[PDB]
């Protein structure tokens, strides 16, 4: 879209309707007359537009009111409320921008942020922007977390996040204007090459792909229409559902063959019954002919009974010769119907070996997309976030995605090599205990009003725990941590001296020979200026391939590539790197997912803050102290950089509302 | 509300393929064996019908007669009346058969004969003799 309505779209808001969050901050307006609502909506949309047209500089309330016309610039407090709303919740004045009003003289409140990934960094900027004292604690020797970029010489390649998934509605659109990201579009054409090294024929590639998509719709029919979501008191996975659907197609193939060969026997037994009729009738005809012959031996002149015998046997014989001729025509009709039937059999198989292997590539690609084996995904809910997907083509970050967190880190107080061990929270405040990752006896204590935890879901899941909470987290939180899925996905970076692949193709597949190994080195990316190829390890292969050494993995990569491009065309690589995200103790995996028996609701549960008990008995209901952001806390944009960013912006708004108050809600 | 084209999924079949650890592979072997036994019965009947066609070798060509053509004359000769009375005794009321035997009488002409000579050839008695067999 475009205009003020495009600004709503670009900020993930409906242009013509007030959201639930807006209703909470502006109950007077939404409960009030429909005319005032349109005024609110225009002010909001216009203010957004002004920010979006130039996100390189702060949009002040003054500048906003400057560019509003009548009747919209009538009520100046309404405009101030709307501006403050949008600012507080990070819809405007987020990321890296030049501030018109320098940061306030004195800081108010103190916040510790655990983790310096995008969710932490984005929250930290907002809180500092609102005038709070912020310190981030990071276990690694760098910022960015799961945004990790390999840099050696002029080779640049992302071992973590590398793709912006469309700019239409994406807050990373705004960040790409604020920071120089060399966004290059990704052409989606992806030729598949079988285990032998031979390309899959264009006709076959389409047949299998269409079947994959039909198999997926089929699982959705299973889920919604047949209600096949529990089986033996166990939630059904997407993988199970796909097996069941595939088995039923194999069954249908067999049922069609059965009723086809049943038509052949029914016809063959109809022919058998006709041929027996004809054998017996031919035997009667033979006998009756002899009798006519004998009656004709009696030469004339003859009495009338002897004449009658000749004439009546003649009649009887032609009557039987008629019958045989009719049966003989029916023999021809049944015999041609047998050639019809035998020439046109149904399908011999549902899927051949080559078909089923190519299909497993499409399943591997889906396992890459959800960063987990299909047997773990909830049938009902695996695609719950599809409706919020952005428009526009996907883009690669060509200069390395680390440029984003590094830019967000500027001006913030970040303690690197600082591993949080314990988080204490009481009615009076909080105490974060951390150690130095190098010399672990060296201990640090950080005292604060509030803790924002951006620890990954894999870390929160650790048993025995890496980080202890005092008091422990309540069961409603720990059960959500348990139920939520935390998948895995690895990359192999191959740096060469020269390009030996098609420079016009961004990606190409490799079909493995087994279902078990379908995710193993199944897809190669060509995204960078330098000659770099990136190989993916998805599905069940990701976890297994972490216990195999780099030399062996790189060897398997070259083996495959020699197969596609020829043995003398593929040199030994100059530099190689292999990610191991499940082994990494500050990650313990890659992406969250909706596991079978989880739902989108667990993402909301992850986002909910914790309020400690009262210090002394009968003291009033204390204030919320422990907050949660990160990839795994945002229902509509989970498992993404933009989701992490948004969750950070969310919590900064919630924390500031709490510890600085919200003047705009009156 | 409807599953995609060429995709087959019914409540009954889903319950049949689920509900055991190996209900799937049971149901699919059951149909493999049903298929092989139906193809058994085809090879069986093809050999039977192949033998029945050996016996029909020749057709009915050596046992066929020429057709005699003659104009439907309305004059009953004594010869033809005597042929009719015997044809009635053999065939009953099958007027078509009686006509074919006599050779030069239409089916209506035969039905007239039944009426005209009922008394004189005791056609009632001749039909009772036929009915008795
Ligand atoms: C292989 C791979 C590919 C990906 N590709 C894409 C993509 O193409 N597009 C996309 O949008 N997203 C992608 N992602 C996802 C994206 O990287 C994450 O969703 C996002 O970066 C996570 O941000 P976060 O701030 O929620 O968590 P993190 O970035 O993990 O930040 C949490 C921080 O906490 C730190 N930490 C852990 N334990 C402690 C401790 N005890 N004390 C202090 N600090 C601690 C970590 O070191 C880390 O810095 C990918 C992820 C992986 C693994």
CSV table of N, CA, C and O and ligand atoms in Angstrom, one decimal, chain A residues 114-120 137-140 144-147 159-163 418-420 454-456 459 467 489 491 581 586 590-591 630-631 639-642 644, ligand 1:
chain,number,residue,atom,x,y,z
A,114,UNK,N,20.1,-9.4,30.7
A,114,UNK,CA,20.9,-10.6,30.5
A,114,UNK,C,20.9,-11.0,29.1
A,114,UNK,O,19.8,-11.2,28.5
A,115,UNK,N,22.1,-11.0,28.5
A,115,UNK,CA,22.3,-11.3,27.0
A,115,UNK,C,22.3,-10.1,26.2
A,115,UNK,O,21.5,-9.2,26.3
A,116,UNK,N,23.2,-10.1,25.2
A,116,UNK,CA,23.5,-9.0,24.3
A,116,UNK,C,23.2,-9.3,22.9
A,116,UNK,O,23.9,-8.9,21.9
A,117,UNK,N,22.1,-10.1,22.6
A,117,UNK,CA,21.6,-10.4,21.3
A,117,UNK,C,20.8,-9.2,20.9
A,117,UNK,O,20.7,-8.2,21.5
A,118,UNK,N,20.0,-9.4,19.8
A,118,UNK,CA,19.2,-8.3,19.2
A,118,UNK,C,18.1,-8.0,20.2
A,118,UNK,O,17.8,-6.8,20.3
A,119,UNK,N,17.5,-8.9,20.9
A,119,UNK,CA,16.4,-8.6,21.8
A,119,UNK,C,16.9,-7.8,23.0
A,119,UNK,O,16.3,-6.8,23.4
A,120,UNK,N,18.1,-8.2,23.6
A,120,UNK,CA,18.7,-7.4,24.6
A,120,UNK,C,19.1,-6.0,24.2
A,120,UNK,O,18.8,-5.0,24.8
A,137,UNK,N,24.7,-7.8,30.5
A,137,UNK,CA,25.7,-8.9,30.8
A,137,UNK,C,25.6,-9.9,29.7
A,137,UNK,O,24.6,-10.5,29.4
A,138,UNK,N,26.8,-10.2,29.1
A,138,UNK,CA,27.0,-11.1,28.0
A,138,UNK,C,28.1,-12.1,28.3
A,138,UNK,O,29.2,-11.7,28.6
A,139,UNK,N,27.8,-13.4,28.2
A,139,UNK,CA,28.8,-14.5,28.4
A,139,UNK,C,29.9,-14.5,27.3
A,139,UNK,O,31.0,-14.8,27.7
A,140,UNK,N,29.5,-14.3,26.1
A,140,UNK,CA,30.4,-14.3,25.0
A,140,UNK,C,31.4,-13.1,25.0
A,140,UNK,O,31.2,-12.2,25.8
A,144,UNK,N,25.6,-9.8,19.7
A,144,UNK,CA,24.8,-10.4,18.6
A,144,UNK,C,24.2,-11.7,18.8
A,144,UNK,O,23.2,-12.1,18.3
A,145,UNK,N,24.9,-12.5,19.6
A,145,UNK,CA,24.4,-13.9,20.0
A,145,UNK,C,24.3,-14.8,18.8
A,145,UNK,O,25.3,-15.1,18.2
A,146,UNK,N,23.0,-15.1,18.4
A,146,UNK,CA,22.7,-16.0,17.3
A,146,UNK,C,22.8,-15.2,15.9
A,146,UNK,O,22.6,-15.9,14.9
A,147,UNK,N,23.1,-13.9,16.0
A,147,UNK,CA,23.6,-13.2,14.8
A,147,UNK,C,25.2,-13.3,15.0
A,147,UNK,O,25.8,-12.5,15.7
A,159,UNK,N,27.2,-17.5,10.1
A,159,UNK,CA,26.9,-18.8,10.7
A,159,UNK,C,25.6,-18.9,11.4
A,159,UNK,O,25.1,-19.9,11.7
A,160,UNK,N,25.0,-17.7,11.7
A,160,UNK,CA,23.7,-17.6,12.3
A,160,UNK,C,22.7,-17.0,11.4
A,160,UNK,O,22.7,-17.5,10.2
A,161,UNK,N,22.0,-16.0,11.8
A,161,UNK,CA,21.0,-15.3,10.9
A,161,UNK,C,21.7,-14.7,9.7
A,161,UNK,O,22.8,-14.1,9.8
A,162,UNK,N,21.1,-14.9,8.5
A,162,UNK,CA,21.5,-14.2,7.2
A,162,UNK,C,20.5,-13.7,6.3
A,162,UNK,O,20.9,-13.0,5.3
A,163,UNK,N,19.2,-13.8,6.5
A,163,UNK,CA,18.2,-13.5,5.6
A,163,UNK,C,17.1,-12.6,6.2
A,163,UNK,O,16.6,-12.9,7.3
A,418,UNK,N,31.0,-12.2,30.7
A,418,UNK,CA,30.3,-12.1,32.0
A,418,UNK,C,29.1,-13.1,32.0
A,418,UNK,O,28.1,-12.8,31.4
A,419,UNK,N,29.3,-14.2,32.6
A,419,UNK,CA,28.3,-15.3,32.5
A,419,UNK,C,27.4,-15.3,33.8
A,419,UNK,O,27.9,-15.6,34.9
A,420,UNK,N,26.1,-14.9,33.6
A,420,UNK,CA,25.2,-14.9,34.7
A,420,UNK,C,25.0,-16.3,35.2
A,420,UNK,O,24.9,-17.3,34.4
A,454,UNK,N,17.0,-12.2,28.5
A,454,UNK,CA,16.9,-12.6,27.1
A,454,UNK,C,17.7,-13.9,26.8
A,454,UNK,O,18.1,-14.2,25.7
A,455,UNK,N,18.0,-14.7,27.9
A,455,UNK,CA,18.6,-16.0,27.7
A,455,UNK,C,17.8,-16.8,26.7
A,455,UNK,O,16.6,-16.8,26.8
A,456,UNK,N,18.5,-17.6,25.8
A,456,UNK,CA,17.8,-18.4,24.9
A,456,UNK,C,17.0,-19.5,25.5
A,456,UNK,O,17.3,-20.0,26.7
A,459,UNK,N,19.0,-22.4,26.8
A,459,UNK,CA,19.6,-22.2,28.1
A,459,UNK,C,18.6,-22.3,29.3
A,459,UNK,O,18.9,-23.0,30.2
A,467,UNK,N,21.6,-21.3,34.8
A,467,UNK,CA,21.2,-20.1,35.6
A,467,UNK,C,20.1,-20.5,36.5
A,467,UNK,O,19.1,-21.1,36.1
A,489,UNK,N,19.9,-26.3,13.7
A,489,UNK,CA,20.2,-26.1,12.2
A,489,UNK,C,21.6,-25.6,12.1
A,489,UNK,O,22.0,-24.6,12.8
A,491,UNK,N,25.4,-24.8,9.7
A,491,UNK,CA,25.9,-24.3,8.4
A,491,UNK,C,27.4,-24.7,8.3
A,491,UNK,O,28.1,-24.8,9.3
A,581,UNK,N,25.4,-25.3,16.9
A,581,UNK,CA,24.6,-24.5,17.8
A,581,UNK,C,24.0,-25.2,19.0
A,581,UNK,O,23.8,-24.6,20.0
A,586,UNK,N,25.9,-21.1,25.2
A,586,UNK,CA,25.2,-19.9,25.3
A,586,UNK,C,24.0,-19.8,24.3
A,586,UNK,O,23.5,-18.7,23.9
A,590,UNK,N,19.0,-23.4,18.1
A,590,UNK,CA,18.9,-22.4,17.1
A,590,UNK,C,17.6,-21.6,17.1
A,590,UNK,O,17.6,-20.3,17.1
A,591,UNK,N,16.5,-22.3,17.0
A,591,UNK,CA,15.2,-21.7,16.8
A,591,UNK,C,14.2,-22.3,17.7
A,591,UNK,O,14.2,-23.5,17.9
A,630,UNK,N,13.2,-11.9,23.8
A,630,UNK,CA,13.8,-12.9,23.0
A,630,UNK,C,12.9,-13.6,22.0
A,630,UNK,O,11.7,-13.7,22.2
A,631,UNK,N,13.5,-13.9,20.9
A,631,UNK,CA,13.0,-14.8,19.8
A,631,UNK,C,11.8,-15.8,20.3
A,631,UNK,O,10.8,-15.9,19.6
A,639,UNK,N,11.3,-17.2,16.4
A,639,UNK,CA,12.4,-17.8,15.7
A,639,UNK,C,13.1,-16.9,14.6
A,639,UNK,O,13.6,-17.4,13.6
A,640,UNK,N,13.1,-15.5,14.8
A,640,UNK,CA,13.6,-14.6,13.9
A,640,UNK,C,14.3,-13.4,14.5
A,640,UNK,O,14.0,-13.0,15.6
A,641,UNK,N,15.1,-12.7,13.7
A,641,UNK,CA,15.8,-11.5,14.2
A,641,UNK,C,14.8,-10.4,14.4
A,641,UNK,O,14.8,-9.7,15.4
A,642,UNK,N,13.9,-10.2,13.5
A,642,UNK,CA,12.8,-9.2,13.6
A,642,UNK,C,11.9,-9.5,14.8
A,642,UNK,O,11.4,-8.6,15.4
A,644,UNK,N,12.9,-11.1,17.7
A,644,UNK,CA,13.8,-10.7,18.8
A,644,UNK,C,13.7,-9.2,19.0
A,644,UNK,O,13.4,-8.8,20.1
C,1,LIG,C1,21.8,-21.2,11.9
C,1,LIG,C2,20.8,-20.1,12.2
C,1,LIG,C3,20.3,-19.4,11.1
C,1,LIG,C4,19.4,-18.4,11.4
C,1,LIG,N1,18.9,-17.8,10.3
C,1,LIG,C5,18.0,-16.7,10.4
C,1,LIG,C6,17.5,-16.0,9.3
C,1,LIG,O1,17.8,-16.3,8.1
C,1,LIG,N2,16.6,-15.0,9.5
C,1,LIG,C7,16.2,-14.7,10.7
C,1,LIG,O2,15.3,-13.7,10.8
C,1,LIG,N3,16.6,-15.3,11.8
C,1,LIG,C8,17.5,-16.3,11.8
C,1,LIG,N4,18.0,-17.0,12.9
C,1,LIG,C9,17.5,-16.6,14.2
C,1,LIG,C10,18.1,-15.4,14.9
C,1,LIG,O3,19.5,-15.5,14.9
C,1,LIG,C11,17.6,-15.4,16.3
C,1,LIG,O4,16.1,-15.6,16.4
C,1,LIG,C12,18.0,-14.2,17.1
C,1,LIG,O5,19.3,-13.7,16.7
C,1,LIG,C13,17.9,-14.5,18.5
C,1,LIG,O6,18.0,-13.3,19.3
C,1,LIG,P1,17.8,-13.3,20.9
C,1,LIG,O7,18.3,-11.9,21.3
C,1,LIG,O8,16.3,-13.7,21.1
C,1,LIG,O9,18.7,-14.5,21.4
C,1,LIG,P2,20.3,-14.5,21.2
C,1,LIG,O10,20.7,-13.7,20.0
C,1,LIG,O11,20.8,-15.9,21.4
C,1,LIG,O12,20.9,-13.6,22.5
C,1,LIG,C14,20.9,-14.1,23.8
C,1,LIG,C15,22.2,-13.8,24.4
C,1,LIG,O13,22.3,-14.4,25.7
C,1,LIG,C16,23.7,-14.8,25.9
C,1,LIG,N5,23.8,-15.7,27.0
C,1,LIG,C17,23.5,-17.0,27.1
C,1,LIG,N6,23.7,-17.5,28.3
C,1,LIG,C18,24.1,-16.5,29.1
C,1,LIG,C19,24.5,-16.3,30.5
C,1,LIG,N7,24.5,-17.3,31.4
C,1,LIG,N8,24.9,-15.0,30.9
C,1,LIG,C20,24.9,-14.0,30.0
C,1,LIG,N9,24.6,-14.1,28.7
C,1,LIG,C21,24.2,-15.3,28.2
C,1,LIG,C22,24.1,-15.4,24.5
C,1,LIG,O14,25.5,-15.5,24.4
C,1,LIG,C23,23.4,-14.4,23.6
C,1,LIG,O15,24.3,-13.3,23.3
C,1,LIG,C24,18.9,-18.1,12.7
C,1,LIG,C25,19.5,-18.8,13.8
C,1,LIG,C26,20.4,-19.8,13.6
C,1,LIG,C27,21.0,-20.5,14.7
